[PDB]
Design a binder for this molecule. Structure first.
Ligand SMILES: Nc1ncnc2c1ncn2[C@@H]1O[C@H](COP(=O)(O)OP(=O)(O)OP(=O)(O)O)[C@@H](O)[C@H]1O
Ligand SMILES: Nc1ncnc2c1ncn2[C@@H]1O[C@H](COP(=O)(O)OP(=O)(O)OP(=O)(O)O)[C@@H](O)[C@H]1O
Ligand SMILES: Nc1ncnc2c1ncn2[C@@H]1O[C@H](COP(=O)(O)OP(=O)(O)O)[C@@H](O)[C@H]1O
Ligand SMILES: Nc1ncnc2c1ncn2[C@@H]1O[C@H](COP(=O)(O)OP(=O)(O)O)[C@@H](O)[C@H]1O
Ligand SMILES: [Mg+2]
Lengths: 72, 139, 257, 890, 543
């Protein structure tokens, strides 16, 4: 059901998994699209995020507890 | 100045922008990020005051509770809303540019520039007449 | 476009601030502001590369990026070439006995400082950032000086370690303290301040009229122990040997007493 | 030998010979105790463990090597005396706990283990290790772990310990940070493994040198080195390498007895058996305070002070055998002289009750100090203060002054602590003037506010690139004193650090307060404290100060009961009767003071009204001195109004009866507007009702309108404020203007109060709920005056003194023509009022203080500030402060 | 070893061999890095990694979760411990020098086992849980070796009376084993054991290692000369080891079981819809705890009385804690019904309360380790009731009635302050000094007997291991013999030596012997001896 929600979403998903099963699943599903790993704690994250909006590259951001308002 | 209290997504920002677009006022949105600091907020306040006081352009200041990070932003805006102008924003070259643009606005409107104090009073009157702030927050 | 115009104006009107250093040259002041501006411009140009309207200005932006990088590639070295030199300066002119202890590195530092002063004189005649960057081979000489300063600093640290090994009690005093001790060996007045850090109770040395023989030791409370056989600094001028003689004679005098 | 030494210590001896005498007495007492019982219990064999357990010294002068001449043996452990010069160190009394510590430590060293004497702080673990090390003539290094820790130094320190062969003791290993603890434990483990391999049974004949891996290099480990880890558990690495020891309960009774015997007391046992339980009681029965210290070190200091007092008494009696002295009286005199100055007013009766319980029927007589008392009385008379002896009014304050003088003699680095409103500044000012007049030595005081400026500006800064050192405030002051180009020496220089104390700006001062008296600047220069310089800390609460700073400073505690209200009233009346507010003005002031004297009595109207107002609810914490200062300023304005009325009527001026009526009613008006003048309407009405109940002066006869709504006219009758409110007609386009103010009862009342409190340049704050009209009314009243230039400063959450400095640079100028630099407004004849609204907004730092608030307090109380550019004292002229803020609960 | 282990694990996961890392608890960060490195795929299936370590909290949680844990504990018993000690010591060390050495080692081993087996009965038997690990045994063995070599130069058999018994006793009492002992009363027990075992009588055939075991049986000393005889005697020990082997009363085992049972319940309580039961529990606590007591103190007159000031402080502290607990429980009641908002602090108390752990903000006085919340609130209620009686007595008559009050020490927050105040009052009366007053204890039968001058009444004192009849102590099997009414009399010291028929019993505060209040000099029956009182853990307890 969670994979179904990830496939059919209108608002960008927020994955909450104590383990890394969902994270690794979303990588292995999106390797052909070159999913990029980032985090809100990373200083270069914004730059990476900028690139994600240019070449149509999916982007993963971890540690959403320290949410970046620039993503609004 | 208007404060909009309610749950997020209720349409406060959208309705405010809709009314501002209908009434002709421009909309100014502060673009905040993780690296946002007090000096950036001061520069945004300077820009909006310059566009609202020196020029007769009317501006609807869009702010949300998210855009406020520290108490300095809130205190600067409290001064702006209550007194109509922030005394410490313009310093040095910024003050000189303010006076030059105020003289330009006075001669455009048909007023005599006179001294710095009268020009600043005219700028404050223009700001309180040509600047409106809407603050959106959750209860 | 106006962003590139701002970059052009800023970097064509930017001047390197210079402040006098002991009436010897003028060192660059304001590294923090210059590095902040360089980082801001580099990040802004990197995002400008990411902007969609960038292909129109692409080539121009690229040029500035290169210039910016070159500026960066200069100044990160330059401050280093300054700092170490200043440090070395504080070691190589505040003392007169460093020359005898470290002659080869003294000559190398004099040769390095001649070129460094010449480069500073050249910079002072044209403090503009673009003018400074365009001088023939600034980065080459700067990196040569940086490597030379690193090598001579390593040699000085090795000599300090050798001095500590010769007299193990020097391990208690600091590196700057040991530099002061070895550099100011001739004037014993500067040694007495640190003498309470090596020995258990010794706080000063009772010397002769000409400070040539160490007659005895003196504690902090004023108690004085007179050596049975006085030790002479003229016969043993190097710091380690005569300090070891002082310690051994102190033990012998305590035993006889 | 003990009798000879005890006879010798009773006479006058040089300090070095005195230290040698007491060391000899201590060791001979230990030898007497060992031989008398531990060897005389039917012991006849030299190999019996009853004698092998004691530390035996064997001297063989025939040995050629110096290190092999003397051998120190305890049980099966044998050590060689290192013959290191120790100078004159403090000797430890050989208590049975110390004997067991020596035995355990020597057993651990013989087995090539380390020592870990764990135990509660203050039991002498580190001192025991140091004494053992000094007994064997080995250099002992103590590494305190109270954030004064550094790997870059201690790696090479460990290398040096392994090389030369010295001892290393850690003050408290658990104080270490986890990473720091683990890494230093790794180093200690390597060193201790090398030490253990130094005693391999198969490799006892060490041919290849036993070395350890220190600083990533091979370091030879001397067999005589040792590492002691004093604790209060051990890391898992060092559990199998270190022998522990429980140093839990020191033998305080034996220590005190031996020290008192060494001091010359002939009744040492009884005195110790009294003084140890007494100190336990003081630690328990007395209240808990940060600056209280009843540990073993304090007991030792008290005992040596008692010995000094007994010797001084012996000398005094001799110049006018002698064993009939009251030793108990001397002991309690020393105890009181050491403890009472730092005792809160609550604990003094408790301390004296404890002394009576332990020392029954033995009383304390304080020093007369009449020579200083005469000069104190003269200075207080010329300074409009109140002086009294003992039970008289001002007795506690003058006794605090005398205690401050005693601690001035005893040591440098004083600390005057006490709640705000006590006689702290006046005490040391009067003491300085009295010392100047008595000893003939001019006294100069430098009052420095530390929190007003940054630490870099306080001490000085080194240029990051130029490596050029520019000295700060304290550094410049000390350098000027030391150089003495004008001759700063031969003058009593007092560097008073008025303000708050936190562990940040006192770091460099720690090396000055202690016996070092040595300020170590970052550039390398070392400034030596001259004997005529005392560093005073005038603080308020002593709440954010580390124990290191407090323990290094003699302390006098100024409780609020020291400065009674009668003293404040007497000072106010004396200043009114002497100081002219502007001869006819002085005559008016004298008449007014004569009129209001009956109300300023012990149980007069003002005292009862203050007591009742303390019960009311105020928006800000009611302080006695704020209240009294507001009342005094209002009375001064009443005298000014009388003078103005006399000026307006050159013929038939104010008569005695009209002045009496006016002053009597204005006193109640000022009491109402100053007492509970910062409270709600209900509290003002309650205080007015209480005043009406207790006073006899005529009051507004109307029973419906509160007294707060009335005012005192110059004719001497109560007139409603509503009569003074005009009806204003404002233009159509000015309706609800941002600046227009319509006069009303509150507006006119606050304007009158504003003018009253600004005539004396007293800063004032308008507190109230948002929208109540504080900023508008304050601005309108300030701009109404023609000679006043108003500058508005909004205090944000990040306000710093730099904003005030920028405002001064923009609006004011520095003029060097007067005696000192004077900061004055550019416009002539204009008083610059810095209306700082939202005055309470600036954030408190980590230690509960606001830098800008302390800055304004310094420039208001003292009248000037120190310019960080050239470390000079500029004096404010024609500069005034006014504030406004929301309630602190918001 | 880090690089060696990394290389070893690499080659072992390549080839397929096994790698052991011993004592990995000393490298927590390295353990975390090892967990991260091992998380990758391991090519070989025959490879095994073992991490032998000690149970310490420094180990990473991730490594514990990612592997299979195996807990190993030593078997209980004197016989097993002595077998382990004899196996650890090499045969060469024991069979060397004078043959007496072997016997000495046996004694040492026995001694070690005793002082280790008494550790399981932690409160009664050793007060605290000392380490007494292998290192102490190695140090004791080294001391024995060195001193026997020193005294007996030749290999010939040294006479048993020529053995340095004093040296061994003093070095294993002051140093080594007694190094970690802090309180005096455990040092007394250790000295008793050392003087009983390490003596010249141990080499005779009639020596008794343990007496009165199981009533009449005694552990006779083996008659051997070599190590083989002693190890065979150890292997012949009966399985029926009662605590009397350690000198402890036989009931101590029972006591231990009781504690263990309670522990189990607590653990079950620690591992258990909650709003209703929390609400009813909190409401029952409000009904149980007294509502409010007011400070009726600070009288200017009679302030000189020490009991006055001490009871003022006690009343203030008790009232403060009472108000705190009452307000917090009312807040819990409100949040259970959803009538108020829940904050972080309230989250802390509710989480602590549901599991059965007392709130740290509630513990303002000395508290027995791991006391369950209901016990805490019942004890608190008793304390407030006693304080209310104190306040009522003070109000009715003044500070004079404050003296004639049978205050229980356990109820007071600081009983030591009460003892000090009693001493000060007895000094103030008759005008004595505190140094000249000594405490004399008289256990009277009447709970409200007359208090004569210096005599002060105390209730609730519980004597463990002995019964007091007519102030004379007698050993008993039953535990916690309550004392009817303790009269503490501060009498002027006569400067005399206490007779050998008295014992200095500690008076601890709670059943966990962690806080010492004072000591009592009690006369014993003529049949018993003070050493039996010392080694059986007889003590007085306030609660
Ligand atoms: N005999 C007296 N001794 C001291 N102060 C007196 C005396 N008589 C009257 N006073 C008044 O009492 C006050 C004492 O204030 P003082 O300067 O000693 O306080 P402070 O502790 O330095 O102040 P702060 O509260 O800012 O810490 C002054 O207003 C002074 O005029
Ligand atoms: N006496 C008065 N005359 C004229 N206007 C008044 C008066 N009292 C209140 N007001 C009005 O009430 C408001 C108060 O304005 P102002 O900003 O001065 O309030 P404040 O209480 O000082 O504010 P804050 O607490 O936010 O600093 C204004 O709209 C002002 O016109
Ligand atoms: N009256 C409305 N009818 C339909 N959609 C609305 C209305 N008001 C708001 N929305 C939707 O809500 C979304 C976000 O609203 P927004 O203005 O961000 O809310 P808020 O002011 O709480 O931030 C928009 O995409 C808009 O489509
Ligand atoms: N046996 C002793 N005889 C005399 N003074 C002692 C003795 N033991 C401790 N002291 C005193 O106690 C003071 C504090 O002891 P210290 O070693 O600092 O305790 P800690 O072990 O907690 O560091 C020292 O100044 C020392 O003079
Ligand atoms: Mg305002």
């Amino acid at each position: 059901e969670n994979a179904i929600m990830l496939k059919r979403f209108n608002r960008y998903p927020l994955i909450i998994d104590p383990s890394g099963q969902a994270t690794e699943f979303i990588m292995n599903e999106y390797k052909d699209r070159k999913i990029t790993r980032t985090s809100f704690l990373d200083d270069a994250f914004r730059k990476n995020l900028e690139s994600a909006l240019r070449f149509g590259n999916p982007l993963l951001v971890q540690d959403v507890e320290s949410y970046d308002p620039v993503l609004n | 100045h208007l404060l909009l209290i309610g749950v997020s997504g209720a349409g406060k920002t959208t309705l405010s922008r809709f009314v501002a677009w209908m009434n002709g006022l421009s909309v100014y949105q502060i673009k905040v990020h993780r690296k946002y600091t007090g000096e950036d907020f001061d520069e945004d306040l300077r820009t909006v005051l310059r566009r609202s006081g020196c020029k007769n352009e009317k501006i609807a200041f869009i702010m949300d509770e998210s855009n406020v990070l520290d108490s300095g932003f809130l205190e600067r805006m409290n001064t702006l809303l209550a007194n109509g102008e922030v005394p410490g924003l313009f310093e040095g070259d910024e003050y000189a540019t303010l006076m030059t643009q105020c003289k330009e606005g006075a001669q455009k409107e048909g007023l005599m520039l006179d001294s710095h104090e009268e020009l600043y009073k005219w700028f404050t009157s223009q700001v309180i007449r040509n600047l409106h702030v809407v603050f959106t927050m959750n209860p | 476009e106006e962003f590139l115009k701002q970059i052009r104006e800023v970097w064509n009107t930017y001047e390197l601030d210079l402040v006098n250093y002991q009436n010897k040259c003028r060192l660059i002041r304001g590294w923090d502001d210059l590095f902040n501006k360089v980082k801001e411009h580099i990040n802004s140009v990197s995002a400008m590369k990411l902007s969609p309207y960038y292909k129109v200005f692409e080539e121009d932006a690229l040029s500035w990026e290169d210039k910016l990088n070159r500026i960066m590639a200069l100044f990160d070295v330059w401050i280093d070439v300054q700092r170490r030199w200043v440090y070395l300066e504080g070691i190589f002119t505040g003392s007169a006995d460093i020359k005898h202890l470290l002659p080869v590195e003294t000559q190398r530092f004099q040769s390095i400082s001649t070129e460094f002063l010449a480069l500073m004189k050249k910079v002072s005649k044209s403090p503009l950032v673009m003018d400074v960057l365009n001088i023939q081979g600034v980065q080459r000489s700067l990196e040569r000086l940086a490597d030379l300063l690193g090598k001579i600093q390593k040699a000085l640290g090795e000599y300090l370690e050798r001095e500590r090994s010769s007299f193990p009690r020097f391990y208690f005093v600091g590196d700057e303290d040991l530099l002061e001790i070895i550099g100011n060996s001739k004037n014993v007045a500067k040694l007495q301040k640190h003498f309470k850090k090596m020995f258990a109770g010794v706080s000063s040395i009772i010397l002769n009229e000409d400070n040539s023989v160490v007659l005895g030791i003196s504690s902090r409370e004023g108690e004085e122990v007179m050596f049975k056989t006085p030790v002479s600094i003229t016969e043993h001028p190097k710091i380690n040997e005569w300090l070891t003689l002082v310690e051994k004679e102190m033990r012998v005098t305590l035993a006889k007493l | 030998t003990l009798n000879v030494l005890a006879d010798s210590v009773l006479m006058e001896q040089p300090p070095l010979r005195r230290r040698k005498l007491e060391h000899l007495i201590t060791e001979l007492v230990h030898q007497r105790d060992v031989t008398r019982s531990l060897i005389k219990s039917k012991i006849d064999n030299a190999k019996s463990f009853e004698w092998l357990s004691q530390m035996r010294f064997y001297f063989d002068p025939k040995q050629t090597d110096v290190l092999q001449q003397l051998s120190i043996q305890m049980a099966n452990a044998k050590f060689n005396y290192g013959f290191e010069y120790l100078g004159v160190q403090d000797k430890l009394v050989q208590t049975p706990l110390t004997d067991r510590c020596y035995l355990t430590m020597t057993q651990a060293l013989e087995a090539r283990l380390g020592g870990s004497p764990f135990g509660p702080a203050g039991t002498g673990k580190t001192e025991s290790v140091k004494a053992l090390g000094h007994q064997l003539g080995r250099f002992v290094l103590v590494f305190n772990c109270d954030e004064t820790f550094d790997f870059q130094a201690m790696g090479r320190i460990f290398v040096g310990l392994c090389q030369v062969g010295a001892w290393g003791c850690f003050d408290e290993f658990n104080r270490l940070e986890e990473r720091m603890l683990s890494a230093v434990s790794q180093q200690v483990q390597c060193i201790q493994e090398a030490l253990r391999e130094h005693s391999n049974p198969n490799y006892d004949k060490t041919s290849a040198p036993i070395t350890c891996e220190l600083l990533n290099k091979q370091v030879k480990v001397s067999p005589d080195m040792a590492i002691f880890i004093t604790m209060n558990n051990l890391p898992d690495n060092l559990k199998k390498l270190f022998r522990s020891l429980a140093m839990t309960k020191p033998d305080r009774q034996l220590i005190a007895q031996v020290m008192l015997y060494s001091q010359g007391f002939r009744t040492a046992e009884v005195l110790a058996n009294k003084i140890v339980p007494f100190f336990k009681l003081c630690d328990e029965q007395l209240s808990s305070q940060s600056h209280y210290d009843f540990g073993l070190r304090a007991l030792k200091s008290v005992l040596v002070s008692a010995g000094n007092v007994k010797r001084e008494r012996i000398q005094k009696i001799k110049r006018e055998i002698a064993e009939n002295l009251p030793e108990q009286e001397i002991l309690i005199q020393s105890v009181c002289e050491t403890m009472v100055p730092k005792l809160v007013a609550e604990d003094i009766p408790l301390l004296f009750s404890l002394l009576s319980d332990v020392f029954p029927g033995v009383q304390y007589h304080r020093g007369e100090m009449t020579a200083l008392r005469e000069e104190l009385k003269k200075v207080c008379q010329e300074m409009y203060l109140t002086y009294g002896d003992g039970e008289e009014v001002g007795g506690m304050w003058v006794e605090k002054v005398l205690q401050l003088y005693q601690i001035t003699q005893i040591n440098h680095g004083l600390m005057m602590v006490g709640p705000s409103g006590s006689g702290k500044s006046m005490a040391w000012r009067v003491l300085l003037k009295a010392l100047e007049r008595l000893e003939g030595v001019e006294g100069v005081a430098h009052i420095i506010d530390p929190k007003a400026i940054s630490k870099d500006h306080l001490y000085g800064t080194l240029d990051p690139n130029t490596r050029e050192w520019t000295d700060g405030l304290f550094t410049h002051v000390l350098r000027k004193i030391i150089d003495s180009v004008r001759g700063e020496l031969q003058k009593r220089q007092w560097i008073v650090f008025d303000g708050d104390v936190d562990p940040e700006w006192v770091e460099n001062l720690n090396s000055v307060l202690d016996d070092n008296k040595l300020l170590t600047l970052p550039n390398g220069e070392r400034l030596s404290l001259p004997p005529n310089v005392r560093i005073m800390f005038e603080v308020q609460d002593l709440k954010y100060a580390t124990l290191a700073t407090v323990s290094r400073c003699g302390m006098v505690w100024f409780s609020e009961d020291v400065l009674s209200t009668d003293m404040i009233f007497n000072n106010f009346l004396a200043r009114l009767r002497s100081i002219p507010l502007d001869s006819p003005m002085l005559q008016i002031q004298r008449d007014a003071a004569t009129i209001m004297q009956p109300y300023f009595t012990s149980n007069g109207l003002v005292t009862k009204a203050l007591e009742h107002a303390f019960q009311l609810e105020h928006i800000m914490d009611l302080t006695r001195l704020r209240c009294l200062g507001s009342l005094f300023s209002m009375l001064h304005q009443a005298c000014r109004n009388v003078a103005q009325y006399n000026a307006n009527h050159p013929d038939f001026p104010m008569q005695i009866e009209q002045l009496e009526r006016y002053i009597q009613r204005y006193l109640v008006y000022a009491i109402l507007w100053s007492l509970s003048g910062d409270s709600r309407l209900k509290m003002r009405a309650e205080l007015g009702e209480y005043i009406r109940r207790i006073t006899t002066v005529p009051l507004p006869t109307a029973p419906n309108i509160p007294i707060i709504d009335y005012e005192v006219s110059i004719s001497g009758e109560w007139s409603p404020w509503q009569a003074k409110v005009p009806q204003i007609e404002v233009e159509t386009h000015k309706v609800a203007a941002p600046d227009v103010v319509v006069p009303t009862l509150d507006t006119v009342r606050h304007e009158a109060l504003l003018y009253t409190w600004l005539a004396e340049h007293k800063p004032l704050v308008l507190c109230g709920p948002p929208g109540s009209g504080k900023t508008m009314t304050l601005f309108s009243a300030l701009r109404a005056l023609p000679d006043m230039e108003v500058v508005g400063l909004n205090f944000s959450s990040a306000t710093t003194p730099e904003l005030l400095l920028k405002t001064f640079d923009h609006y004011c100028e520095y003029r060097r023509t007067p005696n000192g630099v004077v900061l004055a407004p550019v416009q002539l004849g204009k008083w610059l009022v810095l209306f700082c609204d939202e005055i309470n907004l600036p954030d408190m730092d980590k230690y509960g203080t606001q830098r800008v608030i302390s800055f304004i307090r310094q420039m208001v109380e003292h009248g000037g500030f120190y310019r960080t550019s050239d470390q000079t004292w500029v004096k404010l002229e024609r500069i005034q402060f006014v504030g406004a803020c929301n309630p602190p609960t918001d | 070893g880090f690089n060696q282990a990394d290389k070893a694990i690499n080659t072992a996961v390549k080839s397929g061999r096994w790698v052991m890392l011993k004592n990995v608890h000393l490298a927590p960060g390295w353990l975390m890095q090892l967990e991260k490195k091992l998380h990758s795929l391991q090519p070989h299936a025959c490879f095994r990694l073992f991490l032998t370590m000690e149970i310490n909290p420094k180990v990473p949680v991730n490594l514990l979760r990612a592997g299979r844990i195996f807990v190993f504990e030593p078997p209980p018993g004197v016989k097993a411990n002595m077998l382990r000690t004899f196996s650890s010591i090499p045969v060469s060390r024991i069979c060397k020098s004078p043959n007496e050495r072997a016997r000495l080692y046996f004694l040492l081993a026995w001694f070690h086992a005793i002082i280790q087996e008494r550790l399981r009965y932690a409160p009664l038997g050793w007060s605290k849980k000392y380490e007494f690990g292998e290192s102490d045994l190695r140090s004791a063995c080294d001391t024995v070796d060195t001193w026997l070599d020193d005294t007996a130069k030749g290999r010939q058999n040294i006479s048993p009376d020529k053995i340095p018994w004093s040296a061994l006793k003093t070095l294993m009492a002051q140093s080594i084993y007694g190094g970690r002992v802090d309180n005096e009363f455990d040092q007394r027990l250790l000295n008793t054991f050392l003087e009983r075992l390490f003596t010249t009588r141990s080499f005779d055939s009639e020596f008794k290692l343990a007496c009165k075991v199981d009533g009449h049986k005694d552990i006779q000393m083996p008659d051997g000369i070599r190590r083989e005889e002693f190890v065979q005697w150890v292997e012949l020990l009966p399985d029926t080891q009662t605590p009397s082997w350690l000198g402890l009363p036989n009931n101590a085992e029972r006591v231990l079981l009781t504690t263990q049972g309670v522990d189990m319940i607590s653990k079950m309580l620690k591992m258990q819809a909650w709003m209703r039961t929390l609400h009813t529990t909190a409401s029952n606590w409000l009904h149980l705890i007294p509502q409010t007591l007011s400070h009726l103190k600070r009288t200017v007159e009679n302030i000189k009385d020490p009991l006055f000031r001490f009871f003022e402080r006690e009343v203030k502290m008790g009232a403060k804690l009472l108000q705190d607990v009452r307000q917090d429980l009312a807040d819990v009641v409100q949040v259970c019904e959803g009538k108020k908002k829940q904050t972080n602090y309230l989250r802390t108390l509710i989480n602590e309360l549901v599991k059965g752990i007392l709130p740290r903000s509630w513990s303002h006085y000395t508290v027995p380790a791991g006391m369950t919340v209901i016990q805490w609130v019942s004890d608190f209620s008793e304390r407030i009731k006693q304080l209310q009686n104190i306040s009522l007595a003070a109000a009715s008559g003044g500070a004079k009635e404050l003296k004639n009050i049978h205050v229980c020490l356990g109820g007071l927050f600081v009983p030591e302050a009460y003892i000090t105040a009693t001493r000060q009052y007895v000094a103030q009366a008759n005008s004595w000094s505190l140094e000249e007053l000594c405490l004399e204890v008289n256990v009277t039968t009447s709970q409200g007997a007359t208090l004569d001058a210096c005599s002060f009444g105390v209730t609730g004192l519980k004597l463990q291991g002995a019964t007091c009849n007519n102030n004379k102590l007698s050993l008993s099997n039953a535990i916690s013999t309550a004392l009817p009414l303790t009269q503490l009399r501060w009498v002027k010291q006569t400067n005399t030596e206490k007779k050998a028929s008295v014992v200095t019993l500690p008076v601890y505060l709670n059943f966990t012997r962690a806080d010492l209040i004072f000591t009592v000099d009690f006369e014993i029956a003529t049949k018993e001896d003070p050493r039996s009182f010392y080694e059986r853990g007889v003590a007085v307890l306030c609660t």
